[PDB]
């Protein structure tokens, strides 16, 4: 009714927004009850990059992880997937928007990482950019470990190894069930006849430099058999030498 | 009367750590105490401010909260688990927490019996 004209006006504001102080009606959006209708009136597909960055900042600042979850699932990730496919790179404002979305890790993991790696259509450039965005942000140990376990459980793609390796690069202490799952994953590549990219080999490598102190003898020989069956002229001797130069417990 | 109070306390802290019922520090420990969603209060005896101890005692007396006193705060940070560990489990992050507030309990048969026994002996 009468609020529709105001929200149409701020919709027209957001279509040409570059900077400045936002209208105060936008800053009280997560306090509303029927917020999805208001968001559909504001037309998020027509927002600019800085306006969407400030929208992500507003929704991340106002708690309520489920609303941020549905906002990241419905609005932010389709815009990122559209923007990478067009300009072959991510904008500065949207990069800062995903950083401000990693200001809340719980809504980000279930909202941006897991749907992208579960869709199966994630390209290389999206995977590299997003994994660098995780790499930039300091992350909780339990959250990163659960993301590790979930990525290790799902089906393999060329993108998934990039996230797996870049989460290994954080070098935190890992829960042992997660180590069991990733060992089961790499042993799931024991009998695969598909040719593997260099990213899988590098991910396994960085796993062997970092977590060689927490490898039991059985899985040590299992990864040795994995190196035997799936060799590489350069990286396989490195993993093999790092395996013979490891102390357990 | 089998296992001690100073191990049942870490068991209660752990069961709160899984169940997400710990108000640590100063500000979450105080405002959730006044919301009547909190249960227990633990204060470090090693303190730099005395009216801090007076305020903690006043909060405990106002809402009949049982007060537990531990010697120093760095050991309390060791008890709670506010330390960053290695792969082996070596802490490098030594941060001490002063006000430790227990909101929710884990359903225990050993630590709970001991802490209610100590509370009944105290009161």
């Amino acid at each position: 009714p009468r609020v529709l004209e105001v929200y149409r006006g701020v919709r027209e504001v957001l279509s040409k927004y570059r900077s400045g102080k936002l209208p105060k009606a936008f800053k009280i959006i997560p306090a509303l009850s029927n917020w999805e209708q208001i968001l559909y009136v504001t037309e998020p597909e027509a927002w600019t990059a800085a306006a969407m960055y400030q929208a992500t900042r507003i929704f991340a600042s106002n708690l309520k992880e489920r609303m941020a979850q549905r906002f990241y699932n419905l609005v932010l990730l389709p815009r990122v997937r559209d923007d990478v496919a067009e300009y072959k790179r991510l904008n500065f404002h949207l990069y800062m928007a995903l950083k401000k979305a990693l200001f809340k890790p719980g809504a980000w993991f279930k909202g941006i990482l897991i749907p992208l790696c579960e869709s199966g259509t994630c390209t290389l450039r999206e995977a590299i950019i997003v994994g660098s965005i995780i790499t930039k942000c300091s992350i909780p140990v339990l959250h990163s470990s659960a993301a590790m376990l979930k990525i290790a459980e799902m089906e393999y793609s060329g993108a998934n190894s990039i996230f797996l390796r870049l989460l290994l690069d954080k070098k935190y202490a890992l829960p042992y069930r997660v180590l069991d799952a990733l060992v089961f994953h790499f042993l799931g590549f024991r009998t695969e006849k598909r040719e593997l990219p260099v990213l899988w080999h590098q991910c396994l490598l960085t796993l062997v430099q970092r977590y060689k102190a927490d490898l039991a003898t059985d899985q040590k020989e299992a990864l040795l058999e994995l190196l035997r069956l799936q060799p590489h002229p350069q990286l396989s001797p490195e993993i093999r030498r790092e395996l013979q130069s490891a102390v357990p417990r | 009367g089998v296992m001690d109070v100073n191990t049942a306390l870490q068991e209660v802290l752990k069961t709160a750590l899984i169940h997400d019922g710990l108000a640590r520090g100063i500000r979450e420990a105080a405002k959730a105490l006044d919301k009547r969603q909190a249960h227990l209060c633990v204060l470090a005896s090693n303190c730099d401010e005395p009216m801090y101890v007076k305020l903690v005692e006043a909060l405990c007396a106002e809402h009949q909260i049982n007060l537990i006193k531990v010697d120093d705060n760095k050991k309390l940070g060791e008890w709670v688990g506010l330390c960053k560990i290695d792969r082996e489990g070596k802490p490098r992050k030594v941060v001490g927490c002063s006000c430790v507030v227990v909101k929710d309990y884990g359903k225990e048969s050993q630590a709970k019996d001991v802490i209610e026994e100590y509370f009944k002996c105290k009161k």
Binding site: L142, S145, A146, L149, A173, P175, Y176, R177, L179, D180, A181, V183, F184, D214, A216, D218, Q219, R249 | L17, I18, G81, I85, G89
Partner: peptide, 18 residues
């Protein structure tokens, strides 16, 4: 749930996934 297990030397935290 896998088969091989970490066996020895301590579990610091239970970890929450549920």
């Amino acid at each position: 749930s896998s088969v091989m297990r970490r066996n020895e030397q301590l579990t610091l935290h239970d970890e929450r996934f549920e």
